[PDB]
Coordinates of N, CA and C (backbone and C1' of nucleotides) in Angstrom, one line a residue:
Chain K
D1 N 29.1 2.3 -20.7 CA 28.0 2.7 -20.5 C 27.2 1.3 -20.6
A2 N 26.2 1.0 -19.7 CA 25.6 -0.2 -20.0 C 24.4 0.1 -21.0
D3 N 24.1 -0.4 -21.8 CA 23.2 0.0 -22.6 C 22.7 1.7 -23.2
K4 N 24.0 2.2 -23.2 CA 24.0 3.7 -23.8 C 25.5 3.9 -24.4
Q5 N 24.9 4.6 -25.2 CA 25.9 4.8 -26.2 C 27.4 5.8 -25.9
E6 N 27.1 6.5 -24.5 CA 28.5 7.7 -23.9 C 29.3 6.3 -23.3
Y7 N 30.3 6.8 -23.6 CA 31.6 6.2 -22.6 C 32.2 7.0 -21.5
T8 N 32.3 6.2 -20.5 CA 32.4 6.9 -19.3 C 34.7 6.7 -19.1
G9 N 34.8 7.8 -19.7 CA 36.2 7.8 -19.8 C 37.2 7.9 -19.0
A10 N 38.7 8.1 -18.4 CA 39.0 8.6 -17.3 C 38.7 9.5 -16.8
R11 N 38.4 9.5 -15.1 CA 38.1 10.4 -14.5 C 36.7 10.6 -14.8
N12 N 36.0 11.8 -14.8 CA 34.7 11.9 -15.0 C 34.5 12.3 -16.0
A13 N 35.1 12.5 -16.9 CA 35.1 12.6 -17.9 C 34.5 11.8 -19.2
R14 N 33.2 12.5 -19.9 CA 32.9 11.7 -21.1 C 33.2 11.6 -22.4
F15 N 33.2 10.9 -23.4 CA 33.1 11.4 -24.6 C 32.9 10.0 -25.6
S16 N 32.8 10.0 -26.7 CA 32.1 9.1 -27.6 C 33.1 8.7 -29.0
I17 N 33.2 7.4 -29.9 CA 33.4 7.1 -30.7 C 33.0 7.7 -32.1
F18 N 33.9 8.5 -32.4 CA 34.0 9.5 -33.9 C 32.9 8.3 -34.1
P19 N 31.8 9.4 -35.3 CA 31.2 9.0 -36.5 C 31.8 8.5 -38.1
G20 N 33.2 8.9 -38.1 CA 33.7 8.8 -39.0 C 34.6 7.4 -38.8
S21 N 34.5 6.6 -38.0 CA 35.8 5.4 -37.8 C 34.7 4.2 -38.3
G22 N 35.4 3.1 -38.9 CA 35.1 2.3 -38.7 C 34.4 1.4 -37.9
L23 N 34.7 1.1 -36.6 CA 33.8 0.4 -35.6 C 32.9 1.6 -35.3
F24 N 32.3 2.6 -35.9 CA 31.3 3.3 -35.0 C 30.2 2.7 -34.7
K25 N 29.6 1.7 -35.8 CA 28.3 1.1 -35.9 C 28.4 0.2 -34.2
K26 N 30.0 -0.3 -33.8 CA 30.1 -1.3 -33.1 C 31.0 -1.1 -31.4
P27 N 30.5 -0.2 -30.9 CA 31.3 0.3 -29.8 C 31.6 -1.0 -28.7
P28 N 32.7 -1.2 -28.6 CA 33.6 -2.0 -27.6 C 33.2 -1.9 -26.2
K29 N 33.6 -3.2 -25.7 CA 33.4 -2.6 -24.1 C 34.6 -1.8 -23.6
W30 N 35.3 -1.8 -24.0 CA 36.9 -1.3 -23.8 C 37.6 -1.2 -24.7
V31 N 37.6 0.6 -25.1 CA 38.1 0.9 -26.0 C 39.0 1.7 -25.3
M32 N 40.2 2.2 -26.9 CA 40.9 3.2 -26.3 C 40.9 4.1 -27.4
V33 N 41.3 5.5 -27.1 CA 41.3 6.5 -28.2 C 42.8 7.1 -28.3
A34 N 43.1 7.9 -29.7 CA 44.4 8.8 -29.1 C 44.6 9.5 -29.8
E35 N 43.0 10.9 -29.8 CA 43.0 11.9 -29.5 C 41.9 12.7 -29.0
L36 N 41.9 13.4 -27.7 CA 40.7 14.0 -27.2 C 40.8 15.3 -27.4
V37 N 39.5 15.4 -28.3 CA 39.3 17.3 -28.8 C 37.9 17.2 -28.2
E38 N 37.6 18.4 -27.8 CA 36.4 19.6 -27.3 C 36.0 20.1 -28.6
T39 N 34.5 20.1 -28.7 CA 33.4 20.2 -29.4 C 32.1 20.1 -29.0
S40 N 31.4 20.0 -29.6 CA 30.0 20.0 -29.5 C 29.7 19.2 -28.4
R41 N 30.1 18.2 -28.1 CA 30.6 17.4 -26.8 C 32.2 16.7 -27.4
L42 N 32.6 15.8 -26.4 CA 33.7 15.3 -26.4 C 33.6 14.0 -27.5
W43 N 34.6 13.8 -27.9 CA 34.8 12.9 -28.7 C 36.4 11.9 -29.0
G44 N 36.5 10.7 -29.2 CA 37.7 10.0 -29.7 C 37.6 9.5 -31.0
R45 N 38.9 10.1 -31.8 CA 38.5 9.8 -33.1 C 39.3 8.5 -33.5
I46 N 40.4 7.9 -32.9 CA 41.2 6.6 -33.9 C 40.8 5.8 -32.5
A47 N 39.9 4.9 -32.6 CA 39.4 4.2 -31.4 C 39.7 2.9 -32.1
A48 N 40.0 1.9 -30.7 CA 40.1 0.4 -31.3 C 40.0 -0.4 -29.8
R49 N 39.7 -1.4 -30.0 CA 39.1 -2.4 -28.9 C 40.6 -3.1 -28.1
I50 N 40.5 -3.3 -26.8 CA 41.6 -3.7 -26.2 C 41.5 -4.7 -24.8
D51 N 42.1 -5.1 -24.8 CA 41.5 -6.5 -23.7 C 41.8 -5.7 -21.9
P52 N 40.6 -5.8 -21.5 CA 41.1 -5.1 -20.3 C 42.2 -5.8 -19.5
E53 N 42.6 -6.9 -19.4 CA 43.9 -7.6 -18.9 C 45.0 -6.6 -19.4
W54 N 44.9 -6.2 -20.4 CA 46.4 -5.9 -20.9 C 46.8 -4.5 -20.0
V55 N 46.0 -3.5 -19.6 CA 46.4 -2.3 -19.1 C 46.9 -2.3 -18.1
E56 N 46.6 -3.2 -16.9 CA 47.2 -3.5 -15.4 C 48.5 -3.8 -15.5
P57 N 49.0 -4.5 -15.8 CA 50.4 -4.9 -15.7 C 51.6 -3.6 -16.4
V58 N 50.9 -2.5 -17.7 CA 51.8 -1.8 -17.9 C 51.4 -0.4 -17.1
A59 N 50.4 -0.5 -16.1 CA 50.1 0.7 -15.3 C 50.6 0.5 -13.7
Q60 N 51.8 0.1 -13.8 CA 52.0 -0.9 -12.0 C 52.1 0.9 -11.4
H61 N 52.4 2.1 -12.0 CA 52.5 3.2 -11.2 C 51.3 4.2 -11.1
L62 N 50.2 3.5 -12.0 CA 49.1 4.3 -11.9 C 47.9 3.7 -11.5
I63 N 48.3 2.2 -11.0 CA 47.0 1.6 -10.3 C 46.7 2.1 -8.7
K64 N 45.5 2.3 -8.4 CA 44.9 2.3 -7.4 C 44.2 1.8 -6.9
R65 N 45.0 0.3 -5.6 CA 44.2 -0.7 -5.5 C 43.3 -0.7 -4.0
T66 N 42.6 -1.4 -4.0 CA 41.3 -1.0 -2.8 C 41.1 -2.4 -2.5
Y67 N 40.9 -2.4 -1.3 CA 40.7 -4.0 -0.8 C 39.5 -3.9 0.5
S68 N 38.5 -4.9 0.1 CA 37.0 -4.9 0.7 C 37.0 -6.0 1.4
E69 N 36.1 -6.3 2.3 CA 35.5 -7.5 2.6 C 36.4 -8.3 3.3
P70 N 37.0 -8.2 4.1 CA 38.3 -9.0 5.5 C 37.8 -10.1 5.6
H71 N 38.0 -11.6 4.9 CA 36.9 -12.4 6.0 C 38.3 -13.6 5.8
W72 N 38.4 -14.3 7.0 CA 39.4 -15.4 6.6 C 38.6 -17.0 6.5
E73 N 39.3 -17.2 5.7 CA 38.9 -18.6 4.9 C 40.2 -19.9 5.6
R74 N 38.5 -21.1 6.1 CA 39.8 -22.1 5.9 C 40.1 -22.9 5.1
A75 N 39.6 -22.6 3.6 CA 40.1 -23.1 2.5 C 41.6 -23.0 2.6
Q76 N 42.3 -22.1 2.7 CA 43.5 -21.7 2.6 C 44.0 -21.3 4.1
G77 N 43.1 -21.2 4.8 CA 43.8 -20.7 6.6 C 44.5 -19.3 6.6
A78 N 43.7 -18.5 5.9 CA 44.2 -16.9 5.3 C 43.1 -16.1 5.5
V79 N 43.1 -15.0 5.8 CA 42.7 -14.0 5.4 C 41.8 -13.6 3.9
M80 N 41.1 -13.7 3.4 CA 40.4 -13.3 1.8 C 39.7 -12.4 1.7
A81 N 39.7 -10.9 0.8 CA 39.1 -10.1 0.2 C 39.0 -10.1 -1.3
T82 N 38.1 -9.5 -1.2 CA 38.0 -8.5 -2.6 C 38.8 -7.2 -3.1
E83 N 39.4 -7.9 -4.3 CA 40.1 -6.7 -4.5 C 39.5 -5.8 -5.7
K84 N 39.9 -4.7 -5.7 CA 39.4 -3.6 -6.5 C 41.1 -2.8 -7.0
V85 N 41.0 -2.7 -8.4 CA 42.3 -1.6 -8.6 C 41.6 -0.5 -9.8
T86 N 41.9 0.5 -9.4 CA 41.6 1.7 -10.5 C 42.8 2.4 -11.1
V87 N 42.5 3.0 -11.9 CA 43.3 3.7 -12.9 C 43.0 5.4 -12.8
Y88 N 43.0 6.3 -12.2 CA 42.6 7.7 -12.4 C 41.0 7.3 -11.8
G89 N 40.7 6.5 -11.1 CA 39.1 6.1 -10.7 C 38.5 5.0 -11.5
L90 N 39.2 4.1 -12.8 CA 38.8 3.4 -13.6 C 38.6 1.8 -13.0
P91 N 37.5 1.7 -13.0 CA 37.8 0.0 -12.5 C 38.2 -1.0 -13.4
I92 N 39.2 -1.0 -13.6 CA 39.6 -2.2 -14.3 C 39.3 -3.8 -14.3
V93 N 39.4 -4.0 -12.9 CA 38.5 -5.3 -12.2 C 38.0 -4.6 -11.1
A94 N 36.2 -5.3 -11.6 CA 35.2 -4.7 -10.8 C 35.7 -5.7 -9.1
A95 N 35.7 -6.7 -9.3 CA 35.6 -7.9 -8.2 C 37.1 -8.7 -8.6
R96 N 37.8 -9.3 -7.7 CA 38.6 -10.1 -7.5 C 38.9 -10.8 -6.5
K97 N 38.4 -11.9 -6.2 CA 38.8 -12.3 -4.8 C 40.9 -12.9 -4.4
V98 N 40.6 -12.4 -3.4 CA 42.1 -12.1 -3.3 C 43.1 -12.7 -2.0
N99 N 43.9 -12.7 -1.5 CA 44.4 -13.1 -0.7 C 45.2 -12.2 0.6
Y100 N 44.1 -11.8 1.3 CA 44.4 -10.6 2.0 C 45.7 -10.7 3.2
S101 N 45.6 -12.0 3.1 CA 46.5 -12.2 4.4 C 48.3 -12.4 4.2
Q102 N 48.3 -12.2 2.4 CA 49.9 -12.8 2.1 C 50.0 -10.8 1.6
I103 N 49.2 -9.8 1.8 CA 49.0 -8.7 1.3 C 49.6 -7.9 2.3
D104 N 49.0 -8.2 3.6 CA 49.5 -7.4 5.3 C 50.2 -8.4 5.8
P105 N 51.4 -8.3 6.8 CA 51.4 -9.3 7.5 C 51.4 -8.6 9.0
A106 N 50.6 -7.9 9.4 CA 50.5 -7.5 11.1 C 49.5 -7.8 11.1
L107 N 47.8 -7.5 10.5 CA 46.9 -7.6 11.6 C 46.4 -9.5 11.0
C108 N 47.1 -10.0 10.4 CA 46.9 -11.7 9.9 C 47.8 -12.4 10.8
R109 N 48.7 -11.9 11.4 CA 49.8 -12.7 12.6 C 48.6 -13.0 13.6
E110 N 48.0 -12.1 13.8 CA 47.5 -12.4 15.3 C 46.0 -13.1 15.3
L111 N 45.6 -12.9 13.6 CA 44.3 -13.7 13.4 C 44.7 -15.0 13.1
Chain I
rA1 P -91.1 -67.0 87.6 O5' -91.7 -67.4 89.2 C5' -92.8 -67.6 89.1 C4' -93.5 -66.8 89.9 C3' -94.1 -65.8 89.3 O3' -95.1 -65.8 87.9 C1' -93.6 -65.5 91.8
rU2 P -95.1 -64.9 87.0 O5' -95.3 -63.5 88.0 C5' -96.9 -63.0 88.5 C4' -96.9 -61.6 88.5 C3' -96.4 -60.6 87.8 O3' -97.5 -60.0 86.9 C1' -95.6 -60.0 89.7
rG3 P -97.3 -59.5 85.7 O5' -96.5 -58.7 85.5 C5' -97.8 -57.0 85.7 C4' -97.2 -56.0 85.8 C3' -96.3 -55.2 84.9 O3' -96.6 -54.5 84.0 C1' -95.0 -55.3 87.2
rU4 P -96.2 -54.7 82.8 O5' -94.7 -53.7 82.5 C5' -94.9 -52.3 82.9 C4' -93.6 -51.9 83.4 C3' -92.5 -51.9 82.1 O3' -92.7 -50.5 81.1 C1' -91.7 -52.3 84.0
rA5 P -92.6 -50.7 79.2 O5' -92.7 -49.3 79.0 C5' -92.3 -49.2 77.7 C4' -91.3 -47.9 78.4 C3' -90.1 -47.9 77.3 O3' -90.3 -46.6 76.3 C1' -89.2 -48.2 79.5
rC6 P -91.6 -47.3 74.8 O5' -90.9 -46.3 74.4 C5' -90.8 -44.3 74.1 C4' -90.0 -44.0 73.3 C3' -90.2 -43.8 71.9 O3' -89.8 -42.3 71.5 C1' -88.3 -45.0 72.5
rG7 P -90.4 -41.9 70.1 O5' -90.0 -40.0 70.0 C5' -90.4 -39.1 69.1 C4' -89.4 -38.4 69.2 C3' -88.9 -38.2 67.5 O3' -88.6 -37.1 66.9 C1' -87.1 -39.2 68.9
rU8 P -88.1 -36.3 65.4 O5' -88.1 -35.4 65.6 C5' -87.0 -34.8 65.7 C4' -86.3 -33.9 64.5 C3' -86.2 -32.4 64.2 O3' -85.3 -32.2 62.6 C1' -88.0 -33.3 62.3
rC9 P -84.4 -30.8 62.5 O5' -84.2 -30.7 61.7 C5' -82.9 -31.0 61.0 C4' -82.4 -29.9 59.6 C3' -82.9 -28.9 59.7 O3' -81.9 -28.0 58.7 C1' -84.3 -29.4 58.1
rG10 P -80.6 -27.3 59.1 O5' -79.7 -27.2 58.2 C5' -79.2 -26.0 57.1 C4' -80.3 -26.0 56.1 C3' -79.6 -24.9 55.1 O3' -79.4 -25.2 54.2 C1' -82.1 -24.0 56.4
rC11 P -77.6 -24.1 53.7 O5' -77.8 -23.3 52.4 C5' -77.2 -22.7 51.8 C4' -77.1 -21.4 51.7 C3' -75.9 -20.5 51.6 O3' -75.9 -20.7 49.7 C1' -76.9 -19.8 53.2
rA12 P -74.2 -20.5 49.2 O5' -74.4 -19.1 48.4 C5' -75.5 -19.3 47.6 C4' -75.4 -17.4 47.7 C3' -74.3 -16.7 46.5 O3' -74.7 -16.7 45.3 C1' -74.7 -15.6 48.3
rC13 P -73.1 -16.8 44.4 O5' -72.9 -15.2 44.2 C5' -73.8 -14.2 43.2 C4' -73.3 -13.1 43.7 C3' -72.4 -12.4 42.9 O3' -72.8 -11.1 42.4 C1' -72.1 -12.1 44.7
rU14 P -71.7 -10.1 40.9 O5' -71.4 -9.1 41.5 C5' -72.4 -8.2 41.7 C4' -71.4 -7.1 42.6 C3' -70.5 -5.9 41.7 O3' -70.2 -4.8 42.2 C1' -69.0 -7.2 43.8
rC15 P -71.3 -4.0 40.8 O5' -70.4 -2.9 40.5 C5' -70.3 -1.9 40.0 C4' -68.9 -1.4 39.5 C3' -67.9 -2.2 38.6 O3' -67.2 -1.6 37.8 C1' -67.0 -2.0 40.7
rA16 P -67.6 0.1 37.3 O5' -66.4 0.2 36.1 C5' -65.5 1.4 35.9 C4' -66.1 2.1 34.5 C3' -65.5 3.5 34.0 O3' -64.5 3.5 33.6 C1' -68.1 3.5 33.6
rA17 P -63.4 5.0 33.1 O5' -64.0 5.8 33.4 C5' -63.6 7.1 33.7 C4' -63.6 8.4 32.5 C3' -64.9 9.2 32.6 O3' -64.2 10.1 31.6 C1' -65.5 8.0 30.6
rU18 P -63.0 11.5 31.9 O5' -63.9 12.5 32.4 C5' -63.4 13.9 31.6 C4' -63.1 14.9 32.1 C3' -61.9 15.2 33.2 O3' -61.3 17.1 32.6 C1' -63.3 15.3 34.9
rA19 P -60.1 16.7 32.0 O5' -60.6 18.5 31.1 C5' -60.5 19.9 32.4 C4' -60.2 21.0 31.4 C3' -58.8 20.2 30.3 O3' -59.8 21.0 29.2 C1' -57.9 22.4 31.7
rG20 P -59.5 22.9 28.6 O5' -58.3 22.9 28.5 C5' -57.8 24.6 28.0 C4' -56.9 25.4 28.9 C3' -55.8 26.2 28.0 O3' -56.4 27.3 27.4 C1' -55.1 25.3 30.5
rU21 P -55.9 27.3 25.4 O5' -54.6 28.2 25.2 C5' -53.6 28.0 26.4 C4' -52.1 28.0 25.7 C3' -52.3 27.7 24.5 O3' -52.8 28.7 23.1 C1' -50.5 25.9 25.8
rC22 P -53.6 28.4 21.8 O5' -52.8 29.1 20.8 C5' -54.0 30.4 20.1 C4' -53.1 31.9 20.1 C3' -51.9 31.2 19.2 O3' -52.4 31.4 17.8 C1' -51.3 32.5 20.6
rA23 P -51.3 30.3 16.5 O5' -50.3 31.0 15.6 C5' -50.6 32.2 15.5 C4' -49.2 32.9 15.3 C3' -48.2 32.4 14.3 O3' -48.3 32.9 13.4 C1' -47.4 33.2 16.8
rG24 P -47.6 31.4 12.2 O5' -46.0 31.5 12.1 C5' -45.8 33.3 11.9 C4' -44.0 33.0 11.9 C3' -43.2 32.2 11.5 O3' -42.3 33.1 10.8 C1' -43.2 31.9 13.6
rU25 P -40.9 33.1 10.1 O5' -41.3 34.2 9.3 C5' -42.3 35.1 9.3 C4' -42.1 36.1 8.2 C3' -41.7 35.9 6.7 O3' -42.5 35.6 5.8 C1' -40.2 37.5 7.8
rU26 P -42.0 34.0 4.7 O5' -41.1 34.7 3.8 C5' -41.9 35.8 2.8 C4' -40.9 36.3 1.6 C3' -40.0 35.0 1.3 O3' -40.7 34.4 0.4 C1' -38.8 36.3 1.6
rU27 P -40.6 32.6 -0.2 O5' -39.3 32.8 -1.1 C5' -39.3 33.3 -2.1 C4' -37.7 32.8 -2.9 C3' -37.2 31.8 -2.7 O3' -37.4 31.0 -4.1 C1' -35.7 33.4 -1.7
rU28 P -37.7 29.3 -3.3 O5' -36.2 28.6 -3.9 C5' -35.1 29.3 -5.2 C4' -33.8 29.2 -4.6 C3' -33.5 27.7 -4.4 O3' -33.3 26.7 -5.8 C1' -31.9 29.5 -3.3
rC29 P -33.9 25.1 -5.0 O5' -32.5 24.6 -6.2 C5' -31.7 24.9 -7.6 C4' -30.6 25.4 -7.2 C3' -29.4 23.5 -7.0 O3' -29.3 22.8 -7.8 C1' -29.1 25.4 -5.7
rU30 P -30.4 21.8 -8.4 O5' -29.1 20.0 -8.2 C5' -28.1 21.0 -8.4 C4' -27.2 20.3 -6.8 C3' -27.7 18.3 -6.7 O3' -26.5 17.5 -6.8 C1' -28.4 19.6 -4.9
rG31 P -26.3 17.4 -8.7 O5' -28.0 17.8 -9.3 C5' -27.5 17.2 -10.9 C4' -28.5 16.5 -11.0 C3' -29.7 16.5 -11.1 O3' -31.1 16.4 -12.0 C1' -29.5 14.6 -9.5
rU32 P -31.5 14.5 -12.2 O5' -30.1 13.8 -12.7 C5' -30.6 12.6 -13.5 C4' -29.1 12.6 -14.2 C3' -28.9 10.9 -14.6 O3' -28.4 10.7 -16.3 C1' -27.0 11.1 -13.5
rU33 P -28.7 9.9 -17.4 O5' -27.4 8.4 -17.7 C5' -27.5 8.1 -18.8 C4' -26.4 7.1 -18.8 C3' -26.8 5.5 -18.4 O3' -26.4 4.7 -19.4 C1' -25.0 6.4 -17.4
rU34 P -26.6 4.4 -20.7 O5' -25.6 4.1 -21.8 C5' -25.2 5.6 -21.8 C4' -24.3 5.8 -22.7 C3' -22.9 4.4 -22.0 O3' -21.7 4.5 -22.9 C1' -22.4 6.8 -20.9
rU35 P -21.8 3.5 -24.0 O5' -20.5 3.9 -25.0 C5' -20.5 3.1 -26.1 C4' -18.7 3.1 -26.2 C3' -17.7 2.2 -25.3 O3' -16.8 1.8 -25.6 C1' -17.4 3.9 -24.4
rU36 P -16.0 0.4 -25.3 O5' -14.5 0.8 -24.4 C5' -14.3 0.2 -23.6 C4' -13.8 1.3 -22.1 C3' -13.0 0.2 -21.2 O3' -12.2 0.9 -20.0 C1' -15.4 0.3 -20.5
rU37 P -11.1 0.9 -19.6 O5' -10.0 0.7 -20.6 C5' -8.9 0.2 -20.3 C4' -7.8 -0.5 -21.6 C3' -8.5 0.2 -22.8 O3' -7.3 1.1 -23.1 C1' -8.4 -2.1 -22.7
rU38 P -7.7 2.5 -22.7 O5' -7.2 2.8 -21.2 C5' -5.9 2.0 -20.6 C4' -5.2 2.4 -19.2 C3' -4.2 1.8 -18.8 O3' -3.3 2.7 -19.2 C1' -5.8 0.9 -17.1
rU39 P -1.5 2.0 -18.8 O5' -0.6 2.1 -20.2 C5' 0.6 2.1 -20.1 C4' 1.3 1.1 -21.4 C3' 1.1 1.7 -22.4 O3' 1.5 1.2 -23.9 C1' -0.5 -0.2 -22.7
rU40 P 3.2 1.9 -24.3 O5' 4.2 1.4 -25.1 C5' 3.1 0.1 -25.9 C4' 3.5 -1.0 -25.6 C3' 4.2 -2.1 -26.2 O3' 4.8 -3.2 -25.7 C1' 2.2 -2.8 -25.7
rU41 P 6.3 -3.4 -26.2 O5' 6.9 -2.2 -26.2 C5' 7.8 -1.3 -25.6 C4' 9.5 -1.3 -25.3 C3' 9.8 -1.0 -26.4 O3' 10.0 0.2 -26.8 C1' 10.8 -2.8 -25.6
rU42 P 10.0 0.9 -28.2 O5' 11.9 0.9 -28.7 C5' 12.8 2.2 -27.8 C4' 14.2 1.9 -27.6 C3' 14.4 1.9 -29.2 O3' 14.8 2.9 -29.6 C1' 15.2 0.1 -27.5
rU43 P 15.3 3.4 -31.0 O5' 16.9 3.3 -31.4 C5' 17.3 4.2 -30.6 C4' 18.8 3.8 -30.2 C3' 19.7 3.8 -31.5 O3' 20.1 4.9 -32.2 C1' 20.0 1.9 -29.9
rU44 P 20.7 4.9 -33.3 O5' 22.5 5.1 -33.6 C5' 22.4 6.7 -32.6 C4' 24.0 6.2 -31.8 C3' 25.1 6.0 -32.1 O3' 26.3 6.5 -31.9 C1' 25.4 4.2 -31.7
rU45 P 26.5 8.0 -30.8 O5' 26.3 8.8 -32.7 C5' 26.2 10.3 -32.2 C4' 26.3 10.9 -33.7 C3' 25.9 12.5 -34.4 O3' 26.9 13.2 -34.4 C1' 25.6 10.6 -35.9
rU46 P 26.5 14.9 -34.5 O5' 28.3 15.5 -35.1 C5' 29.3 14.9 -34.4 C4' 30.5 15.1 -34.7 C3' 31.2 16.7 -35.9 O3' 32.3 16.5 -35.7 C1' 31.1 14.8 -36.9
rU47 P 32.9 18.4 -35.3 O5' 34.2 17.9 -34.5 C5' 35.1 17.0 -35.5 C4' 36.1 17.4 -36.9 C3' 36.5 18.9 -36.9 O3' 37.4 19.8 -37.1 C1' 35.5 17.4 -39.1
rU48 P 37.7 20.2 -37.1 O5' 39.5 20.7 -36.6 C5' 39.8 21.8 -35.9 C4' 39.9 22.9 -36.2 C3' 41.0 23.3 -37.7 O3' 40.5 22.9 -38.7 C1' 41.0 25.3 -36.1
rU49 P 41.4 22.7 -40.0 O5' 42.7 22.8 -39.5 C5' 43.5 24.3 -40.1 C4' 44.8 24.5 -39.1 C3' 46.2 23.6 -39.3 O3' 46.4 24.0 -40.4 C1' 45.7 23.8 -37.1
rU50 P 47.0 22.9 -41.5 O5' 48.3 22.5 -41.4 C5' 49.5 23.9 -41.4 C4' 50.4 24.1 -40.4 C3' 51.2 22.9 -40.5 O3' 52.6 22.8 -41.1 C1' 50.4 22.8 -38.5
rU51 P 52.9 21.9 -41.9 O5' 54.3 21.5 -41.6 C5' 55.7 22.1 -41.8 C4' 56.2 22.4 -40.5 C3' 57.2 21.5 -40.1 O3' 58.4 20.5 -41.1 C1' 56.3 22.4 -38.6
rU52 P 59.0 19.2 -40.8 O5' 60.0 18.9 -40.2 C5' 61.4 19.2 -39.9 C4' 61.7 18.1 -38.9 C3' 62.0 17.6 -39.0 O3' 63.5 16.7 -38.6 C1' 60.7 17.3 -37.1
rU53 P 64.0 15.7 -39.2 O5' 65.6 15.9 -39.0 C5' 66.8 16.4 -40.1 C4' 67.8 15.7 -40.0 C3' 67.6 14.1 -40.0 O3' 69.1 13.9 -41.2 C1' 69.0 14.5 -38.3

RNA sequence: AUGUACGUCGCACUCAAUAGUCAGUUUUCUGUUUUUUUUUUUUUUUUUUUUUU
């Protein structure tokens, strides 16, 4: 979460980095944990920073792809759109310009 | 050639003052100046548990 020390985990569940961790003082932007435990609040014990590019190719069966703003572009002669990928609803990529025409063949042929 | 004609008159300014109508229960708030600044960015906080060629 932006400028807030709670961590929007998978689904709507929220937890935090354990105070005994070495990186408890610096919570990174993308951190993963080994054990989830229920206590006075939810926490993650063994925390570590990852790059958000790593998760997507290993989660091909888990990504929910989303396509918005279908607009045709002259620069490539095809339909462009901003793509959004989600694992359990988690925005791995908030926005990415993608070629909408290369994805589906039906409607863009008439376009 | 002679004789032959003359006389009186009027005008102006004005103009005040008048009818009748008695009375209205007791008490009350409303009221003044003064310091003026209305607002100054924030943080990471805890632990049932236990076994594997």
